[PDB]
Enzyme design. Structure first.
Site, PDB file in Angstrom:
ATOM      1  N   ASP A 195       0.603   1.894   8.312  1.00 36.91           N
ATOM      2  CA  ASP A 195      -0.426   1.119   7.640  1.00 36.91           C
ATOM      3  C   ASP A 195       0.154  -0.073   6.974  1.00 36.91           C
ATOM      4  O   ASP A 195       0.482  -0.028   5.848  1.00 36.91           O
ATOM      5  CB  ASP A 195      -1.253   1.956   6.628  1.00 36.91           C
ATOM      6  CG  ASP A 195      -2.637   1.398   6.413  1.00 36.91           C
ATOM      7  OD1 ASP A 195      -3.501   2.150   5.940  1.00 36.91           O
ATOM      8  OD2 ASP A 195      -2.995   0.248   6.696  1.00 36.91           O
ATOM      9  N   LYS A 252       1.987   4.836  -0.885  1.00 44.75           N
ATOM     10  CA  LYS A 252       1.387   6.071  -1.374  1.00 44.75           C
ATOM     11  C   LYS A 252       1.632   7.204  -0.376  1.00 44.75           C
ATOM     12  O   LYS A 252       1.839   6.939   0.797  1.00 44.75           O
ATOM     13  CB  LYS A 252      -0.113   5.917  -1.602  1.00 44.75           C
ATOM     14  CG  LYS A 252      -0.885   5.573  -0.368  1.00 44.75           C
ATOM     15  CD  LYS A 252      -2.246   5.082  -0.755  1.00 44.75           C
ATOM     16  CE  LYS A 252      -3.126   4.769   0.443  1.00 44.75           C
ATOM     17  NZ  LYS A 252      -4.483   4.355  -0.106  1.00 44.75           N
ATOM     18  N   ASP A 272       0.764  -1.242   0.000  1.00 46.89           N
ATOM     19  CA  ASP A 272       0.000   0.000   0.000  1.00 46.89           C
ATOM     20  C   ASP A 272       0.799   1.300   0.000  1.00 46.89           C
ATOM     21  O   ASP A 272       0.430   2.255   0.657  1.00 46.89           O
ATOM     22  CB  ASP A 272      -1.021  -0.031   1.149  1.00 46.89           C
ATOM     23  CG  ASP A 272      -2.144   0.898   0.940  1.00 46.89           C
ATOM     24  OD1 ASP A 272      -2.384   1.371  -0.221  1.00 46.89           O
ATOM     25  OD2 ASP A 272      -2.821   1.217   1.917  1.00 46.89           O
ATOM     26  N   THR A 323      -4.159   0.650  -3.728  1.00 44.49           N
ATOM     27  CA  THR A 323      -4.882   1.844  -4.138  1.00 44.49           C
ATOM     28  C   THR A 323      -4.802   1.947  -5.695  1.00 44.49           C
ATOM     29  O   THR A 323      -3.727   1.768  -6.279  1.00 44.49           O
ATOM     30  CB  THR A 323      -4.238   3.037  -3.421  1.00 44.49           C
ATOM     31  OG1 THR A 323      -4.330   2.824  -2.029  1.00 44.49           O
ATOM     32  CG2 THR A 323      -4.998   4.341  -3.614  1.00 44.49           C
ATOM     33  N   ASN A 361       0.244   7.289   3.209  1.00 41.68           N
ATOM     34  CA  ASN A 361       0.709   6.336   4.236  1.00 41.68           C
ATOM     35  C   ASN A 361       2.154   6.650   4.693  1.00 41.68           C
ATOM     36  O   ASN A 361       2.744   5.903   5.485  1.00 41.68           O
ATOM     37  CB  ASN A 361       0.677   4.912   3.676  1.00 41.68           C
ATOM     38  CG  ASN A 361      -0.740   4.334   3.577  1.00 41.68           C
ATOM     39  OD1 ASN A 361      -1.680   4.888   4.112  1.00 41.68           O
ATOM     40  ND2 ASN A 361      -0.863   3.173   2.927  1.00 41.68           N
TER      41      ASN A 361
END
Lengths: 338, 20
Positions: free
Chosen positions: A172, A156, A154, A189, A159
């Site tokens: 996260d 991005k 994840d 995402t 985070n």
């Protein structure tokens, strides 16, 4: 090598905690809730004060009942299990975790600098040196995670937190998973998704290196390489194999990005014979001193301003919500090992 | 410009993960 040795000891450390995870090391009444820093599908993150130490933490709250509806039980068990077991300078430290009748809690180190996302959108874009500082820290983090057979899934700006010293903190691990070989869950995402994932092919650690390339592009350009108003439109752009770089991108940058944003897994940087060295020995990172990034001695190009401990001025405001704890235990069996 | 199309798009805010 000394990196190879560091990793080997690091794997022994991680395995010990992985096999014997920690549990119920705190209770909700030991913290004072202060402010919601962030929101998500299964619950929110709150600034919290530890009443006995006076220490501030970020506390992630997951509603058990919501986790179950969204079929994220296993994912939520992976996150706590991995996070209590890992230890690296750019990974959030999990301090405590516990559960009550109605929720799961993970208390983590509080990074007052706020989300990279917030600064990136405001400023608009980062200079290459700026972007590179952050990217170098992600390269090391993945190197470490992947050595542990962990995939992250994840990555991005949302985070990535900036801490007091202006370094990144990866939070996260909701999609992190320890896998040798392959896995098939569609998650992540949309903008950061590797083509493998969207094509239900089965995939591995390499999707993290793709996501790193989206990241570098978005930091440097101020927008992602594949955007559009709805996800299917994004997924078509990603599977098409077709990127345009802005014209202010150094050619080294474009060149690193082309190897990272590579649809052919056999050809993607990070997934070849030399693994992570293809990235670290690339022209764009020539300026980078890896040991010094690791040891936290490089001057950070951007220290966020913070006017005390527990200042939340680098976080957007959110609507608060009373933490309800049921008198009935809600999904005991499903979360027993949490 | 591409920046301007981005900024005019529906995805300049925080982006949620897709689960399944």
């Amino acid at each position: 090598e000394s990196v190879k040795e560091f990793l080997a000891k690091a794997k022994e450390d991680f395995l010990k905690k992985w096999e014997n995870p920690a549990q119920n090391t705190a209770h909700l009444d030991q913290f004072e809730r202060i402010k919601t820093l962030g929101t998500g599908s299964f619950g929110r993150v709150m600034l919290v004060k530890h009443m006995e130490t006076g220490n501030h933490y970020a506390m992630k709250i997951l509603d058990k009942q919501k986790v179950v509806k969204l079929k994220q039980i296993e994912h939520t068990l992976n996150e706590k299990r991995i996070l209590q077991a890992v230890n690296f300078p750019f990974l959030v430290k999990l301090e405590f975790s516990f559960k009550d009748n109605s929720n799961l809690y993970m208390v983590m180190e509080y990074a007052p600098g706020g989300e990279m996302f917030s600064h990136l959108r405001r400023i608009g874009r980062f200079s290459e040196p700026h972007a590179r500082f952050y990217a170098a820290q992600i390269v090391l983090t993945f190197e470490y995670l992947h050595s542990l057979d962990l995939i992250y899934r994840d990555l991005k700006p949302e985070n990535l937190m900036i801490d007091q010293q202006g370094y990144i903190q990866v939070t996260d691990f909701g999609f992190a998973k320890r896998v040798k070989g392959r896995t098939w869950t569609l998650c992540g995402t949309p903008e950061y998704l590797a083509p493998e994932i969207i094509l239900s092919k089965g995939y591995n650690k390499a999707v993290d290196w793709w996501a790193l390339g989206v990241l570098i592009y978005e930091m440097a350009a101020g927008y992602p390489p594949f955007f559009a108003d709805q996800p299917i439109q994004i997924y078509e752009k990603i599977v098409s194999g077709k990127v345009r770089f802005p014209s202010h991108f150094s050619s080294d940058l474009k060149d690193l990005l082309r190897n990272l944003l590579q649809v052919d897994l056999t050809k993607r940087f990070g997934n070849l014979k030399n693994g992570v060295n293809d990235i670290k020995n690339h022209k764009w990172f020539a300026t980078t001193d890896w040991i010094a990034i690791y040891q936290r001695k490089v001057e950070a190009p951007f220290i966020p301003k913070f006017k005390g401990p527990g200042d939340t001025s680098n976080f957007d405001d959110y609507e608060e919500e009373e933490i309800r704890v049921s008198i009935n235990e809600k999904c005991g069996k499903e979360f027993s090992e949490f | 410009t591409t920046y301007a199309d981005f900024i005019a798009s529906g995805r300049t805010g925080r982006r949620n993960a897709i689960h399944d």
